[PDB]
């Protein structure tokens, strides 16, 4: 599945700067969900791909940014 990278402490999305293909998001997504994950910059937030069904993505409960 796919979803936004979520900071598990603040509950925020990761803002990114270069829309579309983005190494920063690829790197941040793999670091959170594993080396098999992908990710790119979408509406200026990291959107992670190839996630296992159970992976925790935005939004987290009661963790508002």
């Amino acid at each position, epitope marked *: 599945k796919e979803g936004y990278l979520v*900071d598990k402490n*603040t509950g*925020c*999305k*990761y*803002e*990114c*700067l*270069k*829309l*579309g293909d*983005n190494d*920063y*998001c690829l*790197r*941040e997504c793999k670091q959170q969900y594993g080396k098999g994950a992908g990710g790119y*910059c979408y*509406a*200026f*937030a990291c959107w992670c791909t190839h996630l296992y069904e159970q992976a925790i993505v935005w939004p987290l409960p009661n963790k508002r940014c």
Partner: antibody
Amino acid sequence: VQLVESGGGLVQPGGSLRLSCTGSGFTFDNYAMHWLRQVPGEGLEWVSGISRSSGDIDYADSVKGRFTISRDDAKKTLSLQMNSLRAEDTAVYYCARGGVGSFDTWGQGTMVTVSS
Amino acid sequence: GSEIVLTQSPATLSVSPGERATLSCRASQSVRSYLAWYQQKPGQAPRLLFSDASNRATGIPARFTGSGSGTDFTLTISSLEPEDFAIYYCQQYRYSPRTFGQGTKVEIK
């Protein structure tokens, strides 16, 4: 939550100027930061921005190669190195906090004037 | 590359307090929901009004409402207070670079 910017002033075409922005009232580390600008009496234009940990950076086409953005998270500051200035760069320059697509907090603005 | 064009109408809106103000923002093509709104009083820096089509920024009164998705966005000020006379700018963020409308000046009638 407040932003404060400095280092604006007068300059000559081809000249250089370095702006600086200081954040207070929030965890500077956690936020993407941006420079935007506004020609007096005209509309807004995004200039440049930098992500958490300085891991992603970008610039508006009109400014790519001439400007260089950077941050220092210990000092809670954001910088803009302006080079090879032109008449177009004449504007109020705003520092702003990223709101994931939008800009939720703006400083007061510092004026940059390039003649002729 | 091309840039999303945002067309705000009317350029100038005459309204008296207590009346309802309706602002439009139209995009050259669909930006889905990634449409922010700003307010700017003279000599002042802009402030965030909406972060996307319908999400009010913190501190903004519920008299302001945004709606729309795709190409046609509306900002509605239900019962205009005098402090609401300002310039309103729309801004898209689906595509790069981000772009802004040319603004709608809300003046008193």
